[PDB]
């Protein structure tokens with residue numbers, strides 16, 4: 397058996413936009429994301445699937461049933477977010493020098509919190525309190541994340557930006573967003589600190605910058621192709637994290653971390669290790685060096701950025717294979733997240749419904765890399781597979797959990813494993829077709845079914861271990877019987 401520390405917790409992660417809607421009174425039309433996925437031109441271009449989030453799994457209304465299943469599954473931790481748009485659906489008065497590039501301080505005080513409170517949607521706040529109270533009543537440890545991609549529409553009209561009009565609300569391209577996000581985070585900690593165990597400011601900030609302004613075929617708003625603006629968005633998202641960290645800490649003593657989209661960079665050949673290091677610098681270290689060490693390029697240290705992190709949330713799905721080139725490195729198709737769907741990679745490893753390669757060793761790589769560089773504790777905040785049939789997920793689950801065990805054995809302080817996700821949900825531009833749940837959702841009835849992987853996870857969580865009887869699942873799904 398592979399046993400975990402007695403304090404180690406198994407659980408799940410979930411996002412508001414992806415899981416909340418689907419039940420009466422739940423629709424939130426007030427985000428960039430809602431506008432984006434409903435846009436007729438985006439649908440005609442195939443940038444978004446045409447599936448609509450309001451037809452989703454209905455956590456807003458059915459949370460007790462989600463929690464009942466998690467409780468029966470033995471889960472002991474959950475990571476969820478509040479949707480900013482639900483709490484502040486309406487424009488706040490303009491505050492503050494918008495032309496100023498750096499935001500080094502956003503003042504928080506009781507009077508300001510009380511004034512913000514006057515603008516908050518009380519029905520939404522109360523409803524989140526009811527959800528989170530129910531969660532805590534299952535004995536679940538609670539990580540509250542402030543931001544998981546959609547912005548209030550009054551801060552970002554993504555169709556205007558897509559069209560190249562920068563005269564309106566421009567999301568992360570504006571320091572106004574940075575300012576308001578810091579205030580929003582402090583406010584949420586002020587209101588919910590009694591229920592929360594740990595905080596994260598944001599989820600996968602690198603995806604917001606990278607897919608929103610470079611990987612524009614992905615269908616991530618605002619889909620405006622610009623290297624320069626991608627950089628501007630990331631610079632702002634970095635100071636927004638630091639100002640949110642300071643804001644939460646002005647009202648709470650609890651740990652504040654961040655959750656990031658990771659890949660394990662792997663060499664095509666034994667001559668490509670320099671490519672790996674470059675890829676890690678360019679996708680990972682530049683960002684964390686900024687919020688941990690204060691190191692940014694203008695190369696300088698910003699005292700207002702340094703030390704703004706207590707823990708690191710690792711989201712890991714697959715590797716990225718890279719090779720050294722004249723001008724630096726390139727990633728290779730046919731491996732990692734760039735494979736055909738339901739096939740095999742160029743390495744002969746099976747791929748998921750999303751075309752993502754089976755590569756659990758990469759999770760050990762990422763955990764140990766972060767540990768060795770920063771020595772901050774971690775949670776695995778996402779790990780999962782698109783697999784409606786459940787053919788690969790039993791192996792995927794056990795294999796990746798084993799690698800977390802290996803990482804802990806090697807010395808890394810990893811305090812939990814949160815699967816993505818408890819139930820199927822709205823997978824952004826791909827819609828409902830990509831099914832990541834331990835529980836399968838029938839979207840017509842909102843009914844939840846247990847995939848056999850859910851029974852496997854119950855064995856792991858309830859025993860706090862990969863037990864002897866399921867250790868054979870620490871292996872690659874047999875490829876012969878799968879499509880290839």
Ligand SMILES: c1ccc2[nH]ccc2c1
Pocket residue numbers: 428429430432433545546547615616617824825
């Ligand atoms: C669809 C796809 C990606 C997204 N990011 C934020 C909202 C949203 C909607």
Ligand SMILES: [Cl-]
Pocket residue numbers: 657658659660679680
């Ligand atoms: Cl990474």
Ligand SMILES: [Cl-]
Pocket residue numbers: 688689769770
């Ligand atoms: Cl350090």
Ligand SMILES: [Cl-]
Pocket residue numbers: 837838839840
């Ligand atoms: Cl369905």
